[PDB]
């Protein structure tokens, strides 16, 4: 007599923990998939502590709602009992065509029919997957950014045999559980969000490695020039710099070159950023 | 006994203008120069207006400060004149090779030999200009914004040739009229603000043109994912249409379909943005 209720997500990393515990705080039944015993009792520690930046951070989650959520949650390490009575199953495994590629024959095989399937995935389109779903109509992407709670959209994106109806479902979702949906019409490499702001530190890396100002100096530009809060290089510590390295590296050749700047004078000093303390900038 | 005291400015067009009165607002003492009577009458006006802006919306402007400045400006039509006993010469002549060449031909012979030359030129390198003028050790780029007492950036930007005490008089001059200094290292087209401005705009621009989201939309993400107060359609609005239509027009493929966008959907119905009103958004 309702829509989406029972929700599966797989894997419990960094990614699929915060969406299985914002889901599980906003009152849907949250089931966690991953491979053993081991990865539940590790997605069981990473639920604890974002029941803890819940109770500190979220709206709601005070006294006692944070941990409701996480009792709720159920864990399973079988499949096919995971997804049995799945509404939706939102996919957050590693970033690996064959890992996605055998996770969603079978899921295709052990979910019910009504089963909606959304990746999260950052590296591959949903066109790269949807063949072996075998709903091409209830698969596409929702796409979440790292600390849900506070970064709170929710980018969906189908592709062409993705049921309109599906999405608004989908859609319809992403705003119960508290995020802000962000529309995609058709299919884009970097959602919205990766597709504005890589261009921008692109730039501000192009500008660094080739000599023409310091960071400070492209910063202090950015933030006069469009109001901006934090400019490029504040948001590279924020990233974190292994992050943008690995990004980098496998880019174009102004991009390499700044990877290389990168892995000298930041990575190869333990400078990562904000995880570390400091990165382009002290903190 | 002093450094810089008289400064001329070439061109009392919109950016020539302003940097002439915050240049005067702040002691120095100031000749315009244009090309005959009729662009000087326009030049007053212009500088009348700017001190009614500035005593409603710049410190210090108040009881007739902004006047003071206002009627302390020189106004000539004779570029010897002119230039007679100047420490330092803001070019802001219309963005032509031909039109800038022959200023600076004439401007290095006619100025004395201590003579500073910035050009303010949004779209030709000092090293465009540089041999024109027969004093490359004195020669460089101060890059104003529009409305330079509110977004008050000055990018200083010289060629190999430039003398480092000479660029840094400027930037000691960018600081005395009130302005954030913006050092740049090497030459770069775009110098650092519309380095990195320019990106982002192209690539919300790209996911409006191939369909991939709508304007509010892309804002959002952007205000919510960075924290920036305004999106790439919101800064396009402020911008100009009909300013982001033509360098459109003159870039990239995609650019050009934007052009061609913006051209069909906004300037055709004559919505340019913050200027008449409605834009993008509606004022």
Sequence with gaps: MTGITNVTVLGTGVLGSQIAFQTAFHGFAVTAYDINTDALDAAKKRFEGLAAVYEKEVA?????????????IRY??????????????????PESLDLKRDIYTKLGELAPAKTI??????????????????????????????????????????????????????????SAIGMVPIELKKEKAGYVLNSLLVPLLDAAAELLVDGIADPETIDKTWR??????????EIFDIVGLTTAYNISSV???????????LKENYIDKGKLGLATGEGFYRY
């Excluded at 399973?76 to 495994?93: F, G, P, R, T, W």
């Excluded at 990746?119 to 109509?137: A, F």
């Excluded at 880019?251 to 700047?261: I, M, T, V």
Aim: proline letters at 5%; aromatic letters at 10%; hydrophobic letters at 40%.
């Design 60 to 72: 709601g989650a005070a006294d006692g709602a944070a941990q409701k959520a996480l009792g709720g």
């Design 224 to 233: 006069i020039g469009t109001g901006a809060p934090k400019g490029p290089f």
């Design 117 to 174: 399937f959304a990746t999260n995935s950052s590296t591959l389109l949903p066109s790269d997957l949807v063949g072996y779903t075998g709903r091409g109509d209830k698969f596409l992407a929702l796409h979440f950014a790292n600390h849900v709670w506070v970064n709170n959209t929710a980018e969906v994106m189908g592709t062409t045999k993705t049921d309109p109806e599906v999405y608004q479902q989908v859609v319809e979702f992403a």
């Design 76 to 93: 399973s390490d079988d499949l096919a009992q995971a997804v049995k009575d799945a509404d939706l199953v939102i996919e957050a495994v």
């Design 251 to 261: 880019s174009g050749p102004k991009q390499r070159e700044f990877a290389a700047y």
